[PDB]
Design a binder for this molecule. Structure first.
Ligand SMILES: CCOC(=O)c1ccc(OCCCCC2CCN(c3ccc(C)nn3)CC2)cc1
Ligand SMILES: *C(=O)CCCCCCCCCCCCC
Ligand SMILES: *C(=O)CCCCCCCCCCCCC
Lengths: 5, 268, 283, 56, 62, 62, 50, 268, 132, 5
């Protein structure tokens, strides 16, 4: 899904 | 140290050779990298390397040059300067491939009444400019590789006009570092300055630098040593003073691949 | 952990000094640059710094498409006695000066390459005929492959070579290339030869150019107009823009100070005096 | 391609001693040679061959 | 597979972190855009390449 | 229905696995792009098709 | 075919291999659009005899 | 082995060189001692040794000689035979001291219709007899050291009568092993026999043998290789048959001490 | 084997026929695949197959040819070479469809004083070029 | 949703 940073 | 130790006084020992100095200005490790052997993770030729160790990784002293008020500068290429130096040279010419690091020790002593400052520069890939305004990239291998003898800088670009029998050599103008860039910026290269009021010597430890882990030492020079007078030699009142500059270089962590018969180059 | 866009260090407040510590004095002979900040030599106030070195990062410095070449092709009438011009360009950053100078701040580099193609065309004769919209073929010919001899020969089939078919009037064409070097990094400078002159062998045989490694490093771009000859002749130019992306560089060098003279470090007589007159005691 | 910068070297075959036959035996014979790649061998950058063509 | 990152916000509207989204469409890394999420290093290997570490308050030569 | 896979990353930016995303828009497999996620096999059926398994250190003929 | 590697006939060092056969896979070898034919059509004036 | 292995079939690999043989008669390790490097407990020069490893410890093939019905025998001395052999020779001449072991591989193939037997002997300290009946111990260094070329045995002692310009060379009579002892007893020395119906070769592995742990390789030979026809060459019915003998030798575990400038010997 | 077995000595038996050899150089199984009957999962004609077994799967010897210094080479096609061979041929011509694998054994002995080397190749779909 | 690999 969403790899956040 | 309270027990006497100093940045000016050093002892270097490699193989059966030792250098002492009582007037050093510390020493430089180029790009902060000490010489090392080729790691398995970066390796490329698969054959067992030849590593001569003490037989080659020792101090070789090249011919002494002379610094005068007319001196524009001197240059050397590595490994070329060391090609005839004992077992290092032999190992170099018997193998297709070789890599090596170096300890460079430039020697120049004078007296408390002399003046002058030598800039000692170690340049990775020191491609120099040729003598021709009609053809380019045309300096012969023989001229490009002076061996131990080295070459000199000039204050004036003077083009080879003999179009029928071209000299095919370098014409390295000093303020342009012999390559088209300004000398005042050469300090971004690993360097030291022998300022006669401060130090008798310069010591540069050079890693193997290349875009490859190992290469042909006979076809390719990795480092260039350029020594130029940043401040001209002067003494008391003598119109023509002279002091010697001696160059001593040691190969470090050198290894060789691709053994076969010896290379016999056309050097003249 | 220091990001490029992080703020630089704050200025700390500094007071008067009467000490045996001597920051101002040093010895450049050693090879080192004295790491001083204003508070070492003057009284300073406290400043909270907000500036960043984000735009001078190696990516950011090179993150721009530079023109590396202009290719000329044409599509003539069938009846002309001159051949239909297709273009051949040996790939390099050295035909123009601007990007070359920026890359030559460094000895070695690694990068992926983005190529963008701007294509323009015009009518050549004070004629009144017209042409229908042109399609262009940009074929990459890697060292070894058959180079085209004619605008329409078998090589343009491209079964294995990469080709772009560009329609005139559409957005400029663009592709990416990986790091394709046979070395671990691209050498911007090569202090060597590609051949050893051997004693036993002819002088002519061991000879090669100084500073040149593979006689053909990267191959060529071959460009043509796919459309058949129109009665009215049209000439077209293809401008190639190169941007180094995902770039890394090693061993810094002084910038080129005199005009470039060819692919190597050579300089031409008459171009060697870059600096202007200014007196020592004149502001 | 042939290029001095990436030259690979030399293969040569020699007689160490000599070929010895008895009487009633052919004094001349042939050897055949074969080449193949070891498991560490790779190729890259696909291109068109010069070994086939089509004039017209 | 979406990648979400912070923008360093310069001029603010009269309007809390602002983000942007990135998705890679191609199998080859070379096709990817430039991240610009780069690192900084200390200049020492160039500015101070000396074997014996320097203390700026102390005499460079001793 | 999104498919997410790893890129084998060659030249790295001064900037951890990088991914790319794929979605199939069509009902027919023929419309699909090439995965390039391919397998390798051992050359034996061509290089060693002999009934009795060979040991390279041993005499091929015995 | 004799399955030999250099260490069978010469002294070798340890190398950590990074090369791959990715581009010589059957897909990769053929993953390119090749020209198989050129078709010619036209649209003439109404008045022509052809 | 039930899976095919045999005493007749061998593969030897040293450095970038491999020898194969399909008709061997096992191989000999002289005095049961495999070559080794000098141990700290037996060491004597204190300086760091040079150990060339793969650059020198590899197979060098010397010039092929020819066996005929007239052939009385051949001899070689080690390290002398290898003095001009690549990097082994270079290392040998740059150092005062050196020690080395050797793998000797004698090669001689023929056919099922030939006959003959070569005795291949490795002699520690093979001092040979000179050509003079008026003076003794007088063979010149040049004559005593033929290099790669080796020397030959004679069936007849024929004394140098030129008293004014003495030949100063060896006169090695074959049945007296060129030294005054009878050839039939030479089998107490490490040896093998190339009997043409049985084997194409002889392989001898030689330890460094001396009364010292290390010595001057230029002044002193440690081993002598003597090859003599115990049974004369014969073939079918040909009055003058010939078959080649090729000698291939590898230095093993060699190390060198006392590095300085290269020794340039008067060899003529 | 310590009890005498070797890669050079083989015995092949199919149907009422046996081949022996004392000087073989092992044997090749093409593409590593031994012959098999058609599996139900890969089957296509729905009718019960005819499988002649020992009546056809046996060794047929074709006419001997002669190798000389002038000899450029020889070729055969399968099943064609076997079309007149006993019950294999009969079964072949009575049915529209047929499949078969083969053991090919090429025989050529000479003497320790002869020389020469024959390359024996099995080519799938060996389309040859014509004379025009 | 997301079939990862
Ligand atoms: C000789 C001096 O210059 C260099 O060292 C130097 C180094 C690196 C540079 O990068 C060039 C690498 C070329 C690789 C090529 C591979 C693929 N290319 C393609 C591919 C497809 C198409 C349609 N068009 N071009 C075009 C580029 C360019 C020059
Ligand atoms: C990770 O990416 C999972 C979520 C995907 C969200 C939709 C992506 C938008 C369409 C991308 C199509 C694929 C590009 C070839
Ligand atoms: C699995 O795919 C569930 C998530 C879908 C994410 C959005 C897809 C982007 C639009 C695709 C439209 C359909 C194509 C005909």
């Amino acid at each position: 899904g969403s790899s956040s940073t | 140290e309270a027990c006497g130790y100093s940045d000016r006084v050093l002892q270097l020992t490699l193989g059966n050779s030792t250098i002492t100095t009582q007037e050093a200005a510390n020493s430089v490790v180029a790009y902060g990298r000490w010489p090392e052997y080729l790691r398995d993770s970066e390796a490329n030729p698969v054959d067992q390397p030849t590593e001569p160790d003490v037989a080659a990784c020792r101090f070789y002293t090249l011919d002494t040059v002379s610094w005068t008020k007319e001196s524009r500068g001197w240059w050397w290429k590595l490994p070329d300067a060391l090609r005839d130096m004992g077992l290092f040279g032999q190992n170099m010419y018997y193998h297709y491939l070789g890599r090596s690091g170096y300890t460079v020790h430039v020697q120049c002593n004078a007296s408390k009444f002399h003046q002058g400052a030598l800039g000692v520069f170690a340049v990775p890939e020191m491609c120099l400019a040729g003598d021709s305004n009609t053809t380019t990239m045309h300096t012969s291998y023989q001229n490009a590789n002076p061996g131990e003898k080295g070459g000199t800088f000039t204050g004036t670009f003077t083009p080879d006009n003999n179009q029928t029998s071209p000299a095919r050599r370098f014409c390295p103008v000093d303020y342009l570092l012999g390559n088209g860039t300004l000398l005042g910026n050469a300090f971004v290269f690993p360097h030291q300055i022998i300022n006669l009021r401060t130090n008798n010597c310069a010591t540069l430890v050079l890693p193997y630098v290349n875009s490859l882990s190992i290469d042909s030492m006979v076809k390719h020079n990795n480092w260039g040593i350029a020594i130029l007078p940043l401040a001209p030699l002067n003494f008391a009142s003598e119109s023509s003073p002279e002091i010697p500059i001696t160059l001593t270089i040691a190969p470090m962590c050198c290894e060789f691949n691709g053994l076969r018969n010896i290379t016999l180059p056309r050097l003249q | 952990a220091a990001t490029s866009r992080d703020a630089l260090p704050n200025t700390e407040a500094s007071g008067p000094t009467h000490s045996k510590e001597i920051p101002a004095l040093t010895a450049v002979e050693t090879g080192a640059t004295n790491p001083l900040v204003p508070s070492d030599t003057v009284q300073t106030r406290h400043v909270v710094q907000h500036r960043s070195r984000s735009e001078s990062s190696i990516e950011s410095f090179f993150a721009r498409g530079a023109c590396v070449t202009i290719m000329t092709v044409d599509n003539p009438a069938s009846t002309t006695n001159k051949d239909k011009l297709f273009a051949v360009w040996k790939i390099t950053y050295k035909d123009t000066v601007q990007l070359r100078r920026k890359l030559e701040f460094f000895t070695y580099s690694r990068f992926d390459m983005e190529l963008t193609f701007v294509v323009t065309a015009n009518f050549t004769e004070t004629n009144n005929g017209h042409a229908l919209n042109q399609v262009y073929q940009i074929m990459y010919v890697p060292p070894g492959a058959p180079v085209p001899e004619k605008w329409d020969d078998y090589t343009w089939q491209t079964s294995s070579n990469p080709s772009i078919f560009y329609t005139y009037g559409t957005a400029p064409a663009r592709i990416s290339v990986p790091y394709v070097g046979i070395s671990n990094a691209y050498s911007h400078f090569y202090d060597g030869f590609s051949k050893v002159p051997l004693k036993d062998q002819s002088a002519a045989l061991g000879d090669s150019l100084y500073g040149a490694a593979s006689l053909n490093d990267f191959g060529i771009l071959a460009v043509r107009v796919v459309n058949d000859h129109n009665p009215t002749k049209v000439t077209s130019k293809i401008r190639v823009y190169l941007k180094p992306k995902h770039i890394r560089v090693w061993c810094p060098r002084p910038p080129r100070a005199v005009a470039y003279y060819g692919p190597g470090v050579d300089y031409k007589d008459g171009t060697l005096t870059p600096l202007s007159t200014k007196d020592l005691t004149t502001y | 391609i042939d290029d001095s910068f990436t030259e690979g070297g030399y293969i040569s075959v020699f007689y160490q001693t000599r070929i010895v036959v008895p009487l009633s035996t052919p004094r001349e014979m042939d050897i055949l040679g074969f080449v193949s790649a070891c498991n560490d061998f790779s190729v890259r950058l696909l291109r068109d061959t010069t070994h086939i063509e089509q004039k017209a | 597979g979406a990648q979400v990152s912070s923008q360093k916000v310069g001029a603010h509207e009269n309007s809390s972190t602002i983000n942007y989204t990135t998705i890679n469409y191609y199998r080859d890394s070379a096709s990817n855009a430039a991240s610009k999420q780069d690192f900084s290093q200390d200049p020492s290997k160039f500015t101070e390449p000396i074997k014996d570490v320097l203390i700026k308050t102390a005499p460079m030569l001793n």
